[PDB]
Subunit: 198 residues, 2 copies
């Protein structure tokens, strides 16, 4: 059931596993920002678009002082990238799985201040829409709600799953793949239903 | 091994034959003529790259498209110089597929491209090359630009860092092994700097 699938995912997150979030033809591996490992970051760079985003809230955004990249968002989904980031220390080129994580941990770390970060960089922040999947049915909000439900900071890492031939992964592939990495599979509809109820 | 000048010219050939170049200075960047790059190639660079696939351009292509610099005060360790990211305003879907990235790229360079040809933000990341090239700034950005203009191309080229699968950045021997396995010409920014100084 929707509710079963949602709660089963919330578990996965707490056990520090990944979730494969789907909707409508693209699946996003996502992780708690707080728990994610280099090995996991490597995995997402290895099979992701390599465009690895850090979903955050408008308040974490204000806290770090990250302006929205564009004043007038014209992308097909109003995707909502802010200004990109690099950990102001602990990193080198900022591209290694090791470095991306480090950048990420600097962003979430309790009481992170803007000087903790360098702009631009190789981690790409996504501001979640206030209201979550009920305001906006996107992987961005989906990622945020799962984290806050799981009881985490409202910050989580995400990435599209890519076939090696370069095509975006379809559900059966996202599913095959989630299965092969102890990742809980869920859908934004499931999450919307779950939330509507509660 | 040969010479700086030999290596440089040998690369300029690779580019015209529509092959790739492995540019080193440590971190190696696969790069391609923006104009000639194929989805298969884009796939290859997403499959072994950081996945962060950039489109090096000139300040004039930047003005033409009306892309502001992402940050007003660049504080990155290398002043890397990203502008506002992009998506092809048509022909694409989610903009992430190798197919889609290319399409975004072709829209950007296409003769007489106007800003309305593009959507911001998106999944291709423009890099504005510093006026003066590798002689002003010794970066993969300018290295990419000079090679394209030397090869006789538009001053626009696609680039990406080579990543080991374990998630570590590729070192030279790897970049070399790899370039070798894809008919890619290997060159270094020093070689290019030397080449330019002469001419």
């Amino acid at each position: 059931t929707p509710f079963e699938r949602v709660e089963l995912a919330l578990d996965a997150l707490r056990e520090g596993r990944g979730v494969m979030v789907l909707d409508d033809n693209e699946g996003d591996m996502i992780f708690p920002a707080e728990t994610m490992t280099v090995e996991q970051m490597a995995l997402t760079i290895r099979h992701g678009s390599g465009i690895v985003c850090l979903c955050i809230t408008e308040d974490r955004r204000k806290q770090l002082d990250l302006p929205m990249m564009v004043e007038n968002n014209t992308s097909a989904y109003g995707t909502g990238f802010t200004v990109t980031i690099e950990a102001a220390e602990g990193v080198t080129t900022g591209v290694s799985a090791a470095d991306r994580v480090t950048t990420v941990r600097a962003a979430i770390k309790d009481g992170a201040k803007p000087s903790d970060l360098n702009r631009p960089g190789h981690v790409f922040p996504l501001r979640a829409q206030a209201g979550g999947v009920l305001t906006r049915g996107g992987h961005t909000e989906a990622t945020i709600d799962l984290m806050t439900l799981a009881g985490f900071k409202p910050a989580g890492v995400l990435c599209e799953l890519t076939n090696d031939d370069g095509t975006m992964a379809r559900a059966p592939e996202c599913i095959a793949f989630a299965g092969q990495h102890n990742m809980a599979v869920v859908t934004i509809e499931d999450l919307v239903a779950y939330r509507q109820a509660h």
